Amino acid sequence: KPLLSGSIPVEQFVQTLEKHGFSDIKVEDTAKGHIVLLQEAETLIQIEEDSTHIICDNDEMLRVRLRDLVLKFLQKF
Amino acid sequence: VSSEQALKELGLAEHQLRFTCRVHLHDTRKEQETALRVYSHLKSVLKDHCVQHLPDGSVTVESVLLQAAAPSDPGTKVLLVSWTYQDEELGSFLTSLLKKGLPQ
Numbered sequence: 001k002p003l004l005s006g007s008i009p010v011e012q013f014v015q016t017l018e019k020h021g022f023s024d025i026k027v028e029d030t031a032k033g034h035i036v037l038l039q040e041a042e043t044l045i046q047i048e049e050d051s052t053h054i055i056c057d058n059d060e061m062l063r064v065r066l067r068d069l070v071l072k073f074l075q076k077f
Numbered sequence: 078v079s080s081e082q083a084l085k086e087l088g089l090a091e092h093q094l095r096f097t098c099r100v101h102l103h104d105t106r107k108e109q110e111t112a113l114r115v116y117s118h119l120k121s122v123l124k125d126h127c128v129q130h131l132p133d134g135s136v137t138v139e140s141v142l143l144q145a146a147a148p149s150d151p152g153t154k155v156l157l158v159s160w161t162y163q164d165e166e167l168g169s170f171l172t173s174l175l176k177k178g179l180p181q
Contacts, residue, residue, distance in 0.1 A: 001163050003080045004092040042099075053095040058172050063096065067165075074092055077080045 002076040010034040094162040098172045102154045108145045111154045114179050141168050
C-alpha cells in the first residue's frame with residue numbers, strides 16, 4: 001500500500017457521505033478536530049491532523065465504503 | 078525517488094489512516110482463554126506470518142493488533158482488531174476470518 005498525506009475537511013467529508021447514501025450523520029467537535037458519528041455499525045470516524053481513525057462493528061462492506069471515501073481526500077505516495 | 082523522500086521533499090507529513098473493528102465472539106470462558114484460543118487459531122491458519130501472544134494477553138499478526146475490550150454480558154467477547162492502511166489487506170482478512178468464529 002502507498003503512504004498517504006493530506007487533510008479531511010469535515011464539511012466536505014459529510015457532504016460526500018450524504019452523496020453516497022448515508023443520512024442522519026452527526027458531528028462532534030474535539031479540541032482541534034471532529035468525530036463523525038454514524039448509526040451504521042455504530043461507527044465513529046475521528047478526524048484529526050494527519051490522523052483519521054475509523055472505529056466500527058464488523059461490517060466489512062460499510063468499512064470499505066468509508067475507507068474509499070476517506071482515501072479520495074488523500075494523496076497517495 | 079522513494080515514497081518517504083517524495084513526502085519529505087514536499088514538506089508533507091504522513092497521514093495515518095487507522096481502523097479498529099469491534100469483533101464479537103461468543104465464549105463463556107474468561108477473556109484471557111478466548112484470547113489464547115484466538116492466538117492458537119491464527120498461528121495455525123497464518124503459518125507464514127509473524128503471529129504473537131504478548132505478555133499483556135493481546136495478540137498480533139504482523140502489525141495488526143487484536144485486544145480484549147473491557148468485559149461486557151458474560152458470554153460475549155469483543156475483540157478490538159486494529160490496523161493502519163499499510164496493513165489493510167491483512168486487517169480485512171483477519172476481521173473476515175473471525176466472522177466464522179473459532180475452532181470448536
